[PDB]
């Protein structure tokens, strides 16, 4: 009956493709062709954060749009005051092979993980002064590539063991598992209402999960290589991805397929990071070619370049108020652009 | 008003960061590679995510990282070890997959200038196997006498044929696992590697 099941899967995939093609009456370009372009976008460096000594791998903004956390393989998680360049906290990590870090939207915790197969929780508001390890989440058999807080008590992690997990910080147990990817789950982003999240793995696919039921709603496959970055649109009805195929693509949830592709002929390096502007009009992506490209999300035209990093742009985040964008890099420097 | 005290705290922890970096730069970091059951555990014991082993030999602190437990593709994290001093590669002579692994690591874009210390463990077991079975089974194109020394030399040549970069060297040692000289071999190779890297950093090499 294996052949019958394979044929059923093939015909289901064909039906999904036909249904998606039925809803493609017109393209996003044909709809936004008549609107005014954003023009040249010139962002200058406002701050440069010089504390790290090895390659920065992750960074995350606070909900206050002033505090940020960064991760480097020098073994330190640094909390930055962006306005004053002041370093607020320095956290030494048990394992230096960090590849992700998250900041709690309450501002009381930071997450951290990497090649040790563990997500560590750090309390920032201890009564005893210093920052202490409050929890260490250990259920993944592969490396932790991303983690994002939902609240003070639950956090979602993506892993190189091809799975995503939802945890309870108090008990330290996996409340839900998210399975269905066949490659390393390499990136993760949560929706503005935190009721669902999208992940992009190395199987050149992105899946739409919901935390409550723990099931996959939709699968989006348009890329040709491993997806490295993923981000929702501000409305939550669309998301963008970045791959090693040197392209960015925009996907609609309600249309169940790709809307636009962001690429140029002389762009060869893969995308390491991707983020949206406050209104979603600007799509900002980090590249292995040492730069960050600004895209017009509605027109798929390059609107500016964030040049000013000497090594690979590893991470990039936009503040909640939209005032600034941060880029981290393998040159061990964090830059604030505006 | 009280931002002065915050500035003072930031300067203090920047000083701590600098001291930590100076302390960390002294270590010699080595990436420890090879197939499964290739002798990696044996050499790291003679002296779940990632296993780090630290030891000191003749006033050098060595940091050894074993990545065998990462049961996923290496291309997503192999760049995390771009800055290692050298790569330790273990091969069980008494055993193709190792050749492909060495080919992939040796010609990686992140390891162009990284030297590899190649260990050929289980020398006595390899000799016993040769005395039992010919070495032509593994390599069909092996033409020559079926003695221990020439077969080992052929395998050593087969690994070093995988190198294309002139700016890197391969240090091959053969061990029988009944020895305690491996730390010394690593010391000599790493001394040579550090001399080469210092010379390159000075522009004279």
């Amino acid at each position: 009956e294996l052949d019958q099941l394979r044929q059923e899967a093939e015909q289901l995939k064909n039906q999904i493709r036909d249904a998606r093609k039925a809803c493609a009456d017109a393209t996003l370009s044909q709809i936004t062709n008549n609107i005014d372009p954003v023009g040249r976008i010139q962002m200058r460096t406002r701050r440069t954060l010089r504390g790290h000594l090895a390659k920065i791998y992750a960074m995350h903004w606070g909900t206050d749009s002033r505090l940020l956390v960064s991760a480097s393989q020098d073994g330190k998680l640094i909390i930055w005051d962006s306005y004053t360049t002041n370093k607020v906290h320095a956290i030494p990590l048990r394992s230096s092979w960090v590849m992700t870090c998250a900041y709690a939207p309450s501002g009381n915790y930071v997450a951290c993980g990497g090649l040790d197969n563990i997500c560590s929780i750090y309390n920032l508001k201890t009564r005893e002064g210093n920052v202490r390890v409050s929890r260490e989440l250990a259920g993944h058999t592969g490396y932790l590539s991303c983690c994002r807080f939902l609240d003070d008590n639950q956090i979602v992690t993506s892993s190189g063991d091809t799975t995503c997990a939802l945890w309870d910080i108090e008990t330290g147990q996996q409340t839900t598992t998210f399975t269905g990817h066949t490659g390393d789950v390499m990136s993760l982003s949560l929706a503005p209402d935190t009721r669902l999240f999208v992940s992009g793995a190395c199987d050149a696919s992105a899946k739409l999960w919901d935390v409550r039921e723990g099931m996959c709603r939709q699968t989006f496959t348009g890329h040709e290589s491993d997806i490295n970055a993923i981000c929702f649109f501000p409305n939550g009805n669309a998301f963008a991805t970045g791959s090693d195929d040197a392209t960015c693509r925009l996907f609609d949830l309600r249309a169940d397929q790709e809307l636009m592709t962001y690429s140029h002929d002389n762009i060869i390096c893969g995308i390491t990071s991707v983020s949206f502007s406050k209104s979603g009009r600007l799509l900002l992506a980090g590249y292995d070619d040492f730069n960050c490209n600004v895209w017009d999300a509605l027109k798929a035209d390059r609107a500016g370049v964030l040049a000013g990093h000497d090594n690979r742009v590893s991470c990039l985040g936009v503040t909640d108020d939209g005032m600034a964008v941060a880029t981290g890099s393998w040159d061990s420097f964090l830059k604030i652009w505006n | 008003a009280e931002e002065r005290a915050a500035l003072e705290r930031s300067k203090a922890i920047e000083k701590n960061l600098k001291e930590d970096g100076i302390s960390a730069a002294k270590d010699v970091k080595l990436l420890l590679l090879g197939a499964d059951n290739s002798g990696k555990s044996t050499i790291v014991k003679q002296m779940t995510g990632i296993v780090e082993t630290h030891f000191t030999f003749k006033n050098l602190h060595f940091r050894l990282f074993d990545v065998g437990g990462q049961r996923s593709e290496r291309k997503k994290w192999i760049h995390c070890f771009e800055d290692v001093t050298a790569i330790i590669f273990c091969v069980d002579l008494s055993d193709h997959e190792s050749l492909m692994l060495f080919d992939s690591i040796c010609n990686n874009k992140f390891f162009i200038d990284t030297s590899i210390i190649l260990f050929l463990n289980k020398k006595d077991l390899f000799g016993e196997k040769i005395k039992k079975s010919p070495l032509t089974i593994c390599f069909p194109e092996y033409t020559g006498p079926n003695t221990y020394e020439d077969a080992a030399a052929y395998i050593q040549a087969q690994f070093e044929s995988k190198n294309r970069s002139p700016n890197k060297e391969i240090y091959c040692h053969m061990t029988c696992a009944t020895d305690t000289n491996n730390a010394q071999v690593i010391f000599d190779a790493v001394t040579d590697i550090i001399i080469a890297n210092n010379l390159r950093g000075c522009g004279l090499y």
Partner: single-chain antibody
Amino acid sequence: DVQLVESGGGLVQPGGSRKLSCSASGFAFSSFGMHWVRQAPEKGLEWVAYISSGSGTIYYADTVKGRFTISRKNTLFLQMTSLRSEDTAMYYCVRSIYYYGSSPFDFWGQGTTLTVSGSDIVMTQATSSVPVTPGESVSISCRSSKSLLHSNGNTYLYWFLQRPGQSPQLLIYRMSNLASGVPDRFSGSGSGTAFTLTISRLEAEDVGVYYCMQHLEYPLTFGAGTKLELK
């Protein structure tokens, strides 16, 4: 638990010297700045000295400079010389970590009673005593000669509550932020030079003396002290 126990006080002949100690436990002492605050038997709080985390910065009061010394085993010291009759007070040790968003002056010691045989910002509390009943709403106000609002948007007014027989406890820091553990009934508001502390649904545990303190510039100064008594 976080502890701060002080010792070394007693009957002192005038003009002598005595050393006060502040033994710390339960928290990272090295990362906190320490203050000495004294309270005369008939007066209110009075800031004395401050030593920063790492001993880089040290401050003294005007009537204290040259005669006292502050040094910091997880312990803090107050070496006092040439003691006068105006030094009779219960001395407190305070931990005051400083970073963005932090809460300085959050913990006070038990106190050590010691008896001996111009351009500063003035903190004035117009009302010294108010009659109040449980379950009602009371507002305590104080003014500052100079504006406490800074260019960075932070206004540096602090509220402290001292119950009878206990040490001062931080209630509001930077004039709007509620300290950890303080009930939500306490609220602080102000505008530049006038500040008020509003309490809703007064309880029996809120009876005491309320002090407002400025942290805009050294020397740190307290108000006269407004006392709320039952009935």
